[PDB]
Scaffold this motif. Structure first.
Motif, PDB file in Angstrom:
ATOM      1  N   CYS A  97      14.569  58.094 112.454  1.00 62.43           N
ATOM      2  CA  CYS A  97      14.494  56.658 112.650  1.00 62.43           C
ATOM      3  C   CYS A  97      13.613  56.370 113.862  1.00 62.43           C
ATOM      4  CB  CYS A  97      15.896  56.043 112.825  1.00 62.43           C
ATOM      5  SG  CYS A  97      16.697  56.366 114.411  1.00 62.43           S
ATOM      6  N   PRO A  98      13.127  55.134 114.008  1.00 66.31           N
ATOM      7  CA  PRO A  98      12.317  54.798 115.188  1.00 66.31           C
ATOM      8  C   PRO A  98      13.133  54.951 116.457  1.00 66.31           C
ATOM      9  CG  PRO A  98      12.013  53.165 113.442  1.00 66.31           C
ATOM     10  CD  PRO A  98      13.207  53.997 113.070  1.00 66.31           C
ATOM     11  N   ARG A  99      12.507  55.520 117.484  1.00 61.07           N
ATOM     12  CA  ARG A  99      13.253  55.739 118.719  1.00 61.07           C
ATOM     13  C   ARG A  99      13.632  54.434 119.402  1.00 61.07           C
ATOM     14  NH1 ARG A  99       8.948  58.047 123.278  1.00 61.07           N
ATOM     15  NH2 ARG A  99       7.402  56.365 123.058  1.00 61.07           N
ATOM     16  N   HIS A 100      12.979  53.317 119.073  1.00 62.27           N
ATOM     17  CA  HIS A 100      13.337  52.085 119.766  1.00 62.27           C
ATOM     18  C   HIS A 100      14.631  51.467 119.239  1.00 62.27           C
ATOM     19  CE1 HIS A 100      11.076  49.810 116.519  1.00 62.27           C
ATOM     20  NE2 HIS A 100      12.086  48.983 116.715  1.00 62.27           N
ATOM     21  N   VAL A 101      15.352  52.168 118.356  1.00 60.72           N
ATOM     22  CA  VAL A 101      16.730  51.792 118.070  1.00 60.72           C
ATOM     23  C   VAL A 101      17.572  51.791 119.342  1.00 60.72           C
ATOM     24  CG1 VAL A 101      17.596  54.118 117.610  1.00 60.72           C
ATOM     25  CG2 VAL A 101      18.640  52.132 116.452  1.00 60.72           C
ATOM     26  N   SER A 140      24.611  59.376 124.065  1.00 62.26           N
ATOM     27  CA  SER A 140      25.227  60.591 123.555  1.00 62.26           C
ATOM     28  C   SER A 140      25.272  60.527 122.034  1.00 62.26           C
ATOM     29  CB  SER A 140      26.638  60.777 124.128  1.00 62.26           C
ATOM     30  OG  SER A 140      26.609  60.909 125.541  1.00 62.26           O
ATOM     31  N   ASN A 141      25.666  61.648 121.418  1.00 62.76           N
ATOM     32  CA  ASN A 141      25.756  61.701 119.959  1.00 62.76           C
ATOM     33  C   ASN A 141      26.628  60.578 119.406  1.00 62.76           C
ATOM     34  OD1 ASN A 141      24.092  63.963 119.677  1.00 62.76           O
ATOM     35  ND2 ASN A 141      25.813  65.401 119.877  1.00 62.76           N
ATOM     36  N   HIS A 142      27.768  60.313 120.047  1.00 58.30           N
ATOM     37  CA  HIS A 142      28.693  59.317 119.518  1.00 58.30           C
ATOM     38  C   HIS A 142      28.210  57.881 119.710  1.00 58.30           C
ATOM     39  CE1 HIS A 142      30.085  59.432 123.785  1.00 58.30           C
ATOM     40  NE2 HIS A 142      30.299  58.147 123.564  1.00 58.30           N
ATOM     41  N   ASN A 143      27.081  57.663 120.384  1.00 52.74           N
ATOM     42  CA  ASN A 143      26.524  56.325 120.515  1.00 52.74           C
ATOM     43  C   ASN A 143      25.689  55.916 119.311  1.00 52.74           C
ATOM     44  OD1 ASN A 143      26.181  57.133 123.920  1.00 52.74           O
ATOM     45  ND2 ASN A 143      27.500  55.474 123.173  1.00 52.74           N
ATOM     46  N   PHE A 144      25.369  56.854 118.422  1.00 47.24           N
ATOM     47  CA  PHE A 144      24.548  56.581 117.248  1.00 47.24           C
ATOM     48  C   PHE A 144      25.453  56.467 116.029  1.00 47.24           C
ATOM     49  CE2 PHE A 144      21.704  58.725 120.211  1.00 47.24           C
ATOM     50  CZ  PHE A 144      20.632  57.852 120.221  1.00 47.24           C
ATOM     51  N   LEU A 145      25.539  55.265 115.471  1.00 44.72           N
ATOM     52  CA  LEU A 145      26.306  55.027 114.257  1.00 44.72           C
ATOM     53  C   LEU A 145      25.372  55.114 113.059  1.00 44.72           C
ATOM     54  CD1 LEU A 145      28.412  52.088 115.596  1.00 44.72           C
ATOM     55  CD2 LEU A 145      29.156  54.452 115.188  1.00 44.72           C
ATOM     56  N   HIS A 190      21.085  65.011 118.829  1.00 46.80           N
ATOM     57  CA  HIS A 190      19.996  64.048 118.836  1.00 46.80           C
ATOM     58  C   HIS A 190      18.827  64.597 119.638  1.00 46.80           C
ATOM     59  CE1 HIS A 190      22.053  63.021 122.645  1.00 46.80           C
ATOM     60  NE2 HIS A 190      20.854  62.649 123.058  1.00 46.80           N
ATOM     61  N   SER A 191      17.621  64.279 119.178  1.00 41.37           N
ATOM     62  CA  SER A 191      16.420  64.670 119.896  1.00 41.37           C
ATOM     63  C   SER A 191      15.320  63.668 119.595  1.00 41.37           C
ATOM     64  CB  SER A 191      15.968  66.090 119.533  1.00 41.37           C
ATOM     65  OG  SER A 191      15.437  66.144 118.225  1.00 41.37           O
ATOM     66  N   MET A 192      14.386  63.556 120.530  1.00 44.21           N
ATOM     67  CA  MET A 192      13.248  62.662 120.397  1.00 44.21           C
ATOM     68  C   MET A 192      12.001  63.490 120.132  1.00 44.21           C
ATOM     69  SD  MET A 192      12.060  59.599 122.887  1.00 44.21           S
ATOM     70  CE  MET A 192      12.086  60.574 124.382  1.00 44.21           C
ATOM     71  N   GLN A 193      11.314  63.185 119.036  1.00 44.66           N
ATOM     72  CA  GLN A 193      10.038  63.809 118.715  1.00 44.66           C
ATOM     73  C   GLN A 193       8.992  62.711 118.683  1.00 44.66           C
ATOM     74  OE1 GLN A 193       9.787  65.740 114.903  1.00 44.66           O
ATOM     75  NE2 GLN A 193       7.849  66.752 115.428  1.00 44.66           N
ATOM     76  N   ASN A 194       8.122  62.692 119.693  1.00 40.26           N
ATOM     77  CA  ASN A 194       7.131  61.634 119.808  1.00 40.26           C
ATOM     78  C   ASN A 194       7.851  60.289 119.759  1.00 40.26           C
ATOM     79  OD1 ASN A 194       4.821  63.450 119.910  1.00 40.26           O
ATOM     80  ND2 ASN A 194       5.274  63.886 117.756  1.00 40.26           N
ATOM     81  N   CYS A 195       7.584  59.455 118.757  1.00 41.19           N
ATOM     82  CA  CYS A 195       8.203  58.134 118.710  1.00 41.19           C
ATOM     83  C   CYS A 195       9.360  58.025 117.718  1.00 41.19           C
ATOM     84  CB  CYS A 195       7.153  57.070 118.407  1.00 41.19           C
ATOM     85  SG  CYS A 195       5.956  56.873 119.747  1.00 41.19           S
ATOM     86  N   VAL A 196       9.856  59.142 117.193  1.00 44.30           N
ATOM     87  CA  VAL A 196      10.996  59.090 116.288  1.00 44.30           C
ATOM     88  C   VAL A 196      12.165  59.843 116.894  1.00 44.30           C
ATOM     89  CG1 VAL A 196       9.667  58.747 114.167  1.00 44.30           C
ATOM     90  CG2 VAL A 196      10.244  61.090 114.946  1.00 44.30           C
ATOM     91  N   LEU A 197      13.360  59.381 116.546  1.00 48.73           N
ATOM     92  CA  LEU A 197      14.604  60.045 116.886  1.00 48.73           C
ATOM     93  C   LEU A 197      15.051  60.864 115.686  1.00 48.73           C
ATOM     94  CD1 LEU A 197      15.408  59.227 119.717  1.00 48.73           C
ATOM     95  CD2 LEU A 197      17.261  57.875 118.734  1.00 48.73           C
ATOM     96  N   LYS A 198      15.465  62.099 115.938  1.00 47.47           N
ATOM     97  CA  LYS A 198      16.033  62.960 114.912  1.00 47.47           C
ATOM     98  C   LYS A 198      17.518  63.123 115.198  1.00 47.47           C
ATOM     99  CE  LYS A 198      13.062  66.353 115.414  1.00 47.47           C
ATOM    100  NZ  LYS A 198      12.153  67.515 115.198  1.00 47.47           N
ATOM    101  N   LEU A 199      18.350  62.584 114.311  1.00 44.97           N
ATOM    102  CA  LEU A 199      19.800  62.639 114.454  1.00 44.97           C
ATOM    103  C   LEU A 199      20.325  63.708 113.509  1.00 44.97           C
ATOM    104  CD1 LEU A 199      20.645  58.817 114.532  1.00 44.97           C
ATOM    105  CD2 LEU A 199      20.134  60.331 116.452  1.00 44.97           C
ATOM    106  N   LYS A 200      20.771  64.821 114.079  1.00 40.27           N
ATOM    107  CA  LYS A 200      21.406  65.860 113.289  1.00 40.27           C
ATOM    108  C   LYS A 200      22.796  65.400 112.877  1.00 40.27           C
ATOM    109  CE  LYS A 200      21.582  70.534 112.296  1.00 40.27           C
ATOM    110  NZ  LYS A 200      22.131  71.218 113.495  1.00 40.27           N
TER     111      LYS A 200
END
Lengths: 305, 305
Positions: B38-42, B62-67, B80-90
């Protein structure tokens, strides 16, 4: 912002497309519950289509003559019947992917999405309008018969169109899902007049409202008109006569923009009489009539399914 | 026959759309295997977007902040990790509807289908082109960020675009699925020049071939030109310079129609210098550049998926 000719998400319909073969003829079918719907001319050869007697041709067919395949699944046909211009093939398995659905017969000027299919496989999706003369200007190659047109409301698919024929003029004709043709057309390879088409006036006005909402305002003029005066212009330019019902449907767009409908009619009158002088509206160099007022509200509001 | 701006069937992508919420901000995510993109600006408020420090803002999450919600399913975020301008939520569940897929970075002038989504729910699908200046002219309201663009080859979805930003000029900017923006744009609410756009010349030529195939021939002239002479005209009218690579890609369409590419270039030159004189080509009053040569061949041949 921005305004695009947007089709409905096609996923719920993709799960219903099957391939129907009878003899040498293969086309698309629609699998809902334990019934497969398809054009009855699946039972015709190329030579049959010049002057088919469908009752006599169907009598020579049994259940086992209809091959119905869903991806790799072979469906067992346990009954067949003809309803108007569609064949209903009863199969022994209910489609597990059957969505909530309705069969509807739409009015001329209404829009829907087409899922173009070949051999039961989806190729693409696009939005179009039922013309006032009950044709559609689609993209249909050989084998696309049985492709369907639909609208979606939340989780319910309203099927409104099944493709049957390309007329010698290159436009397209088909039926509702009860097999009744839209317009005067018949499923026979013969010359068929479509008759005078007209422009869908209420749709053009809706799109002008969409343009104002997105910031295209150059066409807004300092004039107003009357319903009767505007229609004198509409008749001259082969536009559908505007009625109060149409004015009522444009109400919400008029209220959002603060532009009275008859004021917008006056701007459209000036566009019809003077052209667009090499300008564009929402990226188009002609007046677009394939958006209904509901389409404009949907897109400008972000309605989902 | 007939020629329509056709999107890919969206079903395989519909099954991957989820909703991502962080604080007050909700947008769309793409769920493939056990990763949500998803876009990191979430992670930004409206005020953050004026000048965000994404590293510092993400550290406070933190992980629990992402619904993450897939329809009614709540997904458990385990990394969670940031790759360039996208967030990767495992997440702890692999998407059972994951299609065969690739991440691709497309070239300017290439086309793709967009599935516009809000709150994780698909609203519509449409075909567009990546402009030469790396914007797209889409239909994106508030909450559409995270909607993706894609192509399909048989059973494989090639994801090429994720929506991030509406520029102050009303056009749209986004990233590939590794989070690298197309063009010079950044995910910050500030003035950003897109720079001069140009018309996609090879696409216009492909569409002229589509028109001839469908019987629109009036624009065919008695002239030819040279690649260098045509490009003198292309530069004047802000068209992309045509190269031999482009001529090569048009080969199959030239062979089908028996019209040499440079002959078609001469017809296009006359259209550019003299306009269209109130005529239309394939129902359009301007030169259409949102069909690639591959798009034309696909549609005229009935390629399915």
């Amino acid at each position: 912002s921005g305004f695009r000719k947007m089709a409905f998400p096609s996923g719920k319909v993709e799960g219903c497309m099957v391939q129907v073969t009878c003899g040498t003829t293969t086309l698309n079918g629609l699998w809902l519950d334990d019934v497969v719907y398809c054009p009855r001319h699946v039972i015709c050869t190329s030579e049959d289509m010049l002057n088919p007697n469908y009752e006599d041709l169907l009598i020579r067919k049994s259940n086992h003559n209809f091959l119905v395949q869903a991806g790799n699944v072979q469906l067992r046909v346990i009954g067949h019947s003809m309803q108007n211009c569609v064949l209903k093939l009863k199969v022994d398995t209910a489609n597990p992917k059957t969505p909530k659905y309705k069969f509807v017969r739409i009015q001329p000027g209404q829009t829907f999405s087409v899922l173009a299919c070949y051999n039961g496989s989806p190729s693409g999706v696009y939005q179009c309008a039922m013309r006032p003369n009950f044709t559609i200007k689609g993209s249909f190659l050989n084998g696309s018969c049985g492709s369907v047109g639909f609208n979606i409301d939340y989780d319910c698919v309203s099927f409104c169109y099944m493709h049957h024929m390309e007329l010698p003029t290159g436009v397209h004709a088909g039926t509702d899902l009860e097999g009744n043709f839209y317009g005067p057309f018949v499923d026979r390879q013969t010359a068929q007049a479509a008759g005078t088409d007209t422009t869908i006036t209420v749709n053009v006005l809706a799109w002008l409202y969409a343009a104002v909402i997105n910031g295209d305002r150059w066409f807004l003029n300092r004039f107003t008109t009357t319903l009767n005066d505007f229609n004198l212009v509409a008749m001259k330019y082969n536009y559908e006569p505007l009625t109060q019902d149409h004015v009522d449907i444009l109400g919400p767009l008029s209220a959002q923009t603060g532009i009275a409908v008859l004021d917008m009619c006056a701007s459209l009158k000036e566009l019809l009489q003077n052209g667009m002088n090499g300008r564009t509206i929402l990226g188009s160099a002609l007046l677009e009539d394939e958006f209904t007022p509901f389409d404009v509200v949907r897109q400008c509001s972000g309605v989902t399914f």
